[PDB]
Amino acid sequence: ARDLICAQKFKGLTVLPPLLTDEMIAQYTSALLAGTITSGWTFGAGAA
Amino acid sequence: ITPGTNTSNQVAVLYQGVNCTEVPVAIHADQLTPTWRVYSTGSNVFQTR
Ligand SMILES: *[C@@H]1O[C@H](CO)[C@@H](O)[C@H](O)[C@H]1NC(C)=O
Ligand SMILES: *[C@@H]1O[C@H](CO)[C@@H](O)[C@H](O)[C@H]1NC(C)=O
């Protein structure tokens, strides 16, 4: 077995994890959604 | 992870995609570059994703 990604890990073929985690991307999306819902488009041109 | 030669000569080393437990720095097996070795407990070893 040994999966497929582990097999590719050998022979010097690795994967670099993303700098921004999925949780941080979700937090960005939630902040954008909250800004759009509460402040409309005002927060995109200054303070909310 | 050097913060710049001008600022300081202290550096940090990031080993990519390896668990710290089975491959630490203090092992006498000399995992390549025998003279190039970080101190065993210079700073706490942090395991990141
Ligand atoms: C480091 O950079 C600062 C910023 O320009 C500079 O003033 C300083 O002289 C530099 N350090 C050395 C040792 O030259
Ligand atoms: C590293 O190995 C130790 C002992 O086998 C284990 O407890 C730990 O979960 C491992 N860490 C990772 C990130 O795989």
Swiss-Prot record, chain A:
Effect of residue 14 to N: In strain: Lambda/C.37
Function: Subunit of the fusion protein that is processed upon entry into the host cell. Mediates fusion of the virion and cellular membranes by functioning as a class I viral fusion protein. Contains a viral fusion peptide that is unmasked after S2 cleavage. This cleavage can occur at the cell membrane by host TMPRSS2 or during endocytosis by host CSTL. In either case, this triggers an extensive and irreversible conformational change that leads to fusion of the viral envelope with the cellular cytoplasmic membrane, releasing viral genomic RNA into the host cell cytoplasm.
Name of this protein: Spike protein S2'
Organism: Severe acute respiratory syndrome coronavirus 2
First and last residues shown, out of full length: 846 to 893 of 1273
From Swiss-Prot, chain B:
Region (Disordered): 24-43
Top-level division of the source organism's lineage: Viruses
Sugar-bearing residue positions: 6, 19
Documented effect of changing residue 16 to H: In strain: A23.1
Known function: Attaches the virion to the cell membrane by interacting with host receptor, initiating the infection. The major receptor is host ACE2. When S2/S2' has been cleaved, binding to the receptor triggers direct fusion at the cell membrane. When S2/S2' has not been cleaved, binding to the receptor results in internalization of the virus by endocytosis using host TFRC and GRM2 and leading to fusion of the virion membrane with the host endosomal membrane. Alternatively, may use NRP1/NRP2 and integrin as entry receptors.
Subunit structure: Binds to host ACE2. RBD also interacts with the N-linked glycan on 'Asn-90' of ACE2. Cleavage of S generates a polybasic C-terminal sequence on S1 that binds to host Neuropilin-1 (NRP1) and Neuropilin-2 (NRP2) receptors. Interacts with host integrin alpha-5/beta-1 (ITGA5:ITGB1) and with ACE2 in complex with integrin alpha-5/beta-1 (ITGA5:ITGB1). May interact via cytoplasmic c-terminus with M protein. May interact (via N-terminus) with host bilirubin and biliverdin, thereby preventing antibody binding to the SARS-CoV-2 spike NTD via an allosteric mechanism.
Name listed for the protein in its UniProt record: Spike protein S1
Protein species of origin: Severe acute respiratory syndrome coronavirus 2 (2019-nCoV)
Gene: S
